[PDB]
Amino acid sequence: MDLKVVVSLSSRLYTDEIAKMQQRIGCILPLASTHGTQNVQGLGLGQVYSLETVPDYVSMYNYLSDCTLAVLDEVSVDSLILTKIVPGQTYAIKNKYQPFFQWHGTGSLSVMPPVFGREHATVKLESNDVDIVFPMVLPTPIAEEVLQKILLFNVYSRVVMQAPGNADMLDVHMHLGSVSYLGHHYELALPEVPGPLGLALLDNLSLYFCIMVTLLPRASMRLVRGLIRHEHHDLLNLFQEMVPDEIARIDLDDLSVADDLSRMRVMMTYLQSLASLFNLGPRLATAAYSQETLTATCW
Amino acid sequence: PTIAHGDGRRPSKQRTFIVVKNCHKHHISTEMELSMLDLEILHSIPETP
Amino acid sequence: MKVQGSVDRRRLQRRIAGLLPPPARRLNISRGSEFTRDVRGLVEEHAQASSLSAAAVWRAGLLAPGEVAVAGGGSGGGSFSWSGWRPPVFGDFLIHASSFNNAEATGTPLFQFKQSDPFSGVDAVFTPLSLFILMNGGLTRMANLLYDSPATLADLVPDFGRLVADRRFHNFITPVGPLVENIKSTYLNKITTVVHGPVVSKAIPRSTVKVTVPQEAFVDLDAWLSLQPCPADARLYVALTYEEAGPRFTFFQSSRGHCQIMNILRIYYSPSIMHRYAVVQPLHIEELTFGAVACLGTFSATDGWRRSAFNYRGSSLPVVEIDSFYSNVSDWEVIL
Amino acid sequence: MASNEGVENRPFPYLTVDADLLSNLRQSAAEGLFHSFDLLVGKDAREAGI
Amino acid sequence: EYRSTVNPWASQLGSLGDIMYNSSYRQTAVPGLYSPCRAFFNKEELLRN
């Protein structure tokens, strides 16, 4: 019925940081406890993302899905007033995140750690000896695009250990390093060392791959074989005239419908559960957005 | 104030200090749970002893 | 003068006057007063029952357009946005009276097996102990007291040999929710559960309902795992696991999150996956699946799931009980 | 948990006494100073049915 | 006055003890545990005063 938290600062803040914090009014940041009054230490994302420890980017995701999000409402010299986000309510939220992505009306938003930069997110409170780190929110189509970019880097950076190859570490940085958008290219900050909990997520992904590879429908494989030669298509333009040798070696036996049918039945059940692995974070639903007002009505 | 000295010492003229102090804010809260059954039978009119 | 437009002032003000006032919160407090007519109204919550009189029904407010009763009739009416209290959605099942033991805990979660005969009129519904005897100290001594002649349960599920072999037994079982009401009849019982709603007792003198799971099966996933946040909600899950010994049923509690929980359950079942995959069954087409998981509802963290006994037939069974449950069923996700 | 087989929660008319029973109470029940105790918190701290 | 240090292996900036207990290089460390030598080797903690 009443959804409000009063975060109290121990020490007055300086006239420059009260001005910086006010630019973030209407932004989400996750607090630790669901209580009416709190300290500043639970406020930001700052403890998981510190300067002294490497950013994992997957322990940070796990911190968001556990916390309780809140919308910053009012800023003063000694306080920060928020309203918590609970399941069965609607909220009015502004688009004020610094690497600027533009939202659509009637779209779904996603919450992810500050992938684009540590400096874009933080408002440093040197008066209270804390750094308040805001999470970055994106439209769902582009948020998944960034999450995939980060995971494949954890593999390929490790696969290419120290290679003098001009091809390596220049292709994996030009492909995975950036995310393009409407008339822009946004660089991602990618970890120098792929840490744990990011590889442990890719271990689970592989287990699904070890299963699916045994039940692939062969009728599917014979179709792509006929199309890469006979017809010309934009989807199959990825494959050149050359055909993957694995398919010719995997698919030898003649097609039987009764087998490819039950192969599809077993496989489809894994994709349904595979989807749970990819969300990895809280999602919002937006019903109205004004290009000029910069205010959505999220649910 | 100051003292008058005979030597060539550089005289410190009139001096004043202006100092400012500011307010601090404190908040306090507690939580108490209640049963819907009691909150409801608060409303009803009892028919039997 | 001209009649003001089509719209009529002083007539919309009356109509909007009803819509304006929101419900009451944040009342000011005085230790001198310490209990007021103001504090009362803020606290009273307008129970939804009556004594069956045309005048008494108007008193309680059952005949009100909103989905929940607003007391006083029209007085205090038109708020319609107050703590979003959603009433429970009950389900009614017709059961073979010999299939269901009448001595059930009134809160036990139920499961319906989807029959495969068209245009039937009776249903098959199982408790955690019925499912134990069907799937074949502890539950073994207690479930056999409640259910003897396990054949009558085997008659409901005629494919159980086939279903657990192809590992598609779980998708014909749909969770329904805790017991709320049970009429005890000679031939065809009538059972009432609560699906997707605050599990609340419909008896006339109200009593708190708490869902009960046998302690043998209930596994706290959060303590076994043991800065991290402390959220409001915690969730209850079921896992149907096809092992070498046979199918198995377990209940779980944690407040991590879905993507995490699906990872913790794979770590938790790693010893038992290796064993089945090496001893008896390396590989086949359909037999690949291991198990499934569903979510049974959300209850308050920091509390709930006390432990208690279930006394019947001069023997007890240690059982856990969850408070303030909110039933909310999702589909099965394959773990492997 | 752990009524310890001794307590009935029926609503009695209790008698107020001036003595101080609060002193060091929590850590007394936690370690079995007295058996057959009950500990009710929040919603549970209410009169029982009749 | 007569000596520069007692052990360079800890006094000097890039030295072993500085490497072990100063925050600049312990990125990999688990944040839970408590280090007594942190108050003596951390740079920000020294310059705060």
Swiss-Prot record, chain A:
One of its GO terms (molecular function) is structural molecule activity. It comes from the Viruses. It is found in: Virion; Host nucleus. GO terms for cellular component: host cell nucleus; viral capsid. Its main location: virion. Keywords: Capsid protein, Host nucleus, Virion. Belongs to the herpesviridae TRX2 protein family. Interacts with TRX1 and major capisd protein/MCP. Structural component of the T=16 icosahedral capsid. The capsid is composed of pentamers and hexamers of major capsid protein/MCP, which are linked together by heterotrimers called triplexes. These triplexes are formed by a single molecule of triplex protein 1/TRX1 and two copies of triplex protein 2/TRX2. Additionally, TRX1 is required for efficient transport of TRX2 to the nucleus, which is the site of capsid assembly. This is Triplex capsid protein 2. It comes from Epstein-Barr virus (strain B95-8) (HHV-4). The gene is TRX2.
Curated annotation (Swiss-Prot), chain B:
It is found in: Virion; Host nucleus. Belongs to the herpesviridae major capsid protein family. Self-assembles to form an icosahedral capsid with a T=16 symmetry, about 200 nm in diameter, and consisting of 150 hexons and 12 pentons (total of 162 capsomers). Hexons form the edges and faces of the capsid and are each composed of six MCP molecules. In contrast, one penton is found at each of the 12 vertices. Eleven of the pentons are MCP pentamers, while the last vertex is occupied by the portal complex. Homomultimer. Makes the hexons and eleven out of twelve pentons. Interacts with triplex proteins 1/TRX1 and 2/TRX2; adjacent capsomers are linked together in groups of three by triplexes, heterotrimeric complexes composed of one molecule of TRX1 and two molecules of TRX2. Interacts with scaffold protein; this interaction allows efficient MCP transport to the host nucleus. Interacts with capsid vertex component 2/CVC2. Interacts with the small capsomere-interacting protein/SCP. This is Major capsid protein. It comes from Epstein-Barr virus (strain B95-8) (HHV-4). The lineage of its organism: Viruses, Duplodnaviria, Heunggongvirae, Peploviricota, Herviviricetes.
UniProtKB/Swiss-Prot annotation, chain C:
Coiled coil: none annotated. Keywords: Capsid protein, Host nucleus, Virion. GO terms for biological process: viral capsid assembly. HAMAP family: HSV_TRX1. Structural component of the T=16 icosahedral capsid. The capsid is composed of pentamers and hexamers of major capsid protein/MCP, which are linked together by heterotrimers called triplexes. These triplexes are formed by a single molecule of triplex protein 1/TRX1 and two copies of triplex protein 2/TRX2. Additionally, TRX1 is required for efficient transport of TRX2 to the nucleus, which is the site of capsid assembly. Disulfide bonds: none annotated. Signal peptide: none annotated. GO terms for molecular function: DNA binding. This is Triplex capsid protein 1.
